[PDB]
Enzyme design. Sequence first.
Site, mmCIF file in Angstrom:
data_model
loop_
_atom_site.group_PDB
_atom_site.id
_atom_site.type_symbol
_atom_site.label_atom_id
_atom_site.label_comp_id
_atom_site.label_asym_id
_atom_site.label_seq_id
_atom_site.Cartn_x
_atom_site.Cartn_y
_atom_site.Cartn_z
ATOM 1 N N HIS A 95 54.128 1.005 44.125
ATOM 2 C CA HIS A 95 55.419 0.892 43.462
ATOM 3 C C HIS A 95 56.557 0.298 44.307
ATOM 4 C CE1 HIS A 95 59.163 2.361 41.679
ATOM 5 N NE2 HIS A 95 58.547 2.389 40.493
ATOM 6 N N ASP A 96 57.022 -0.902 43.890
ATOM 7 C CA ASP A 96 58.170 -1.639 44.415
ATOM 8 C C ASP A 96 58.204 -1.775 45.941
ATOM 9 O OD1 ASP A 96 58.730 -1.659 41.701
ATOM 10 O OD2 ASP A 96 60.709 -0.699 41.862
ATOM 11 N N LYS A 113 58.462 -5.815 37.200
ATOM 12 C CA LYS A 113 59.157 -4.550 37.016
ATOM 13 C C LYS A 113 60.592 -4.736 36.516
ATOM 14 C CE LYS A 113 58.691 -0.155 38.627
ATOM 15 N NZ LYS A 113 60.013 0.501 38.851
#
Lengths: 203, 204
Positions: A32-33, A116
Amino acid sequence: KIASYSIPLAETFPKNKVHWHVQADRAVLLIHDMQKYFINFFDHSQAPVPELLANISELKSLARQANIPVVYTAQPPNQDPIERALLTDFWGTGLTKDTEIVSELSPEDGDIQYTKWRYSAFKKTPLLERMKETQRDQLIIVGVYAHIGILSTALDAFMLDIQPFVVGDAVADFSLEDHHHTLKYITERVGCVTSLEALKPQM
Amino acid sequence: PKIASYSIPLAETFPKNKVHWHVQADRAVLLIHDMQKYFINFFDHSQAPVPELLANISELKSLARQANIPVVYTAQPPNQDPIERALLTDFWGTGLTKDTEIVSELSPEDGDIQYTKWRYSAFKKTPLLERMKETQRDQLIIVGVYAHIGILSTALDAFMLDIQPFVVGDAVADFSLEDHHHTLKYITERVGCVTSLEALKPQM
């Protein structure tokens, strides 16, 4: 600018309410990111960033060996204000540079990257559709930031019948207080808080 | 758990808002989140935060009806199918079976809408987003219980779905004052607007 802090030890993690276990045939690893833009808010050479990168790198290798799909999330640069919407009111117009994944975690052949748009990795993405098509209902969540995107992704997973597994020592946040508060919230209301050591044999 | 008594924090103790949003009657929806007898039974009604909670929601519902701001109630259904309830059982046990009705003080009147609630978020498996898109309403005034669970998740989904969430700090209640304060802080910092009954009155 995030002040330096040490990733908490697994012995300090809150006790899990649920007794879930990762099964390779059912799991997806979500990085995630982990974009240079988000990691730039920390001093990269200082804690929690070296341990975060080493733990995600180890877990990613294990996932590839176990045939567990690896999915990266990344915010796009120069976002259309209409698409970015209410995020602007809190964070400004968003990233324009450093959109690439940190070099230590560069995606390899077979790894997938999703664009995202929101805190949750499920909003405006093919993640739920791909998890349903492949009969995968377990999400291993690693990356930044624990109380924001990691938390929202896990809350969504949970509500969409996907078991979230937040790796307490493979996440980082704005502070140690935020980091601990997120793990406590996960164990109590959302899913499983695991560690690199507990997770290693289950994969 | 049985919730120990606590006073709803006063508006001056609320954290400072990062965003400068204002409720406009033509754009707003009032969400009375899970004000069912089952959930309010975990508190001692005769003690705080319940009397202030019920009076403030009642005052706000009355203003909304005068302002033609739609009033939406959410309620969890009894004897839920385990497949539909899914992962919630692992945390809270099987679906509730009694006291599914809205607390008598907040009984829906003619024109109010009630949606069946399946998840923490009032947007999951409901016509809420579809009804707001259609009526051009992009502001959600959130009141009810519990601040850190359903109120928080609904607000997060609102913000992510381009709906401005307005959490009324003095018209919400939680498992504790600590949880209540942490939710308000989280909202102001990452999700939306924390408002009070006094501040909403002129906006309505």
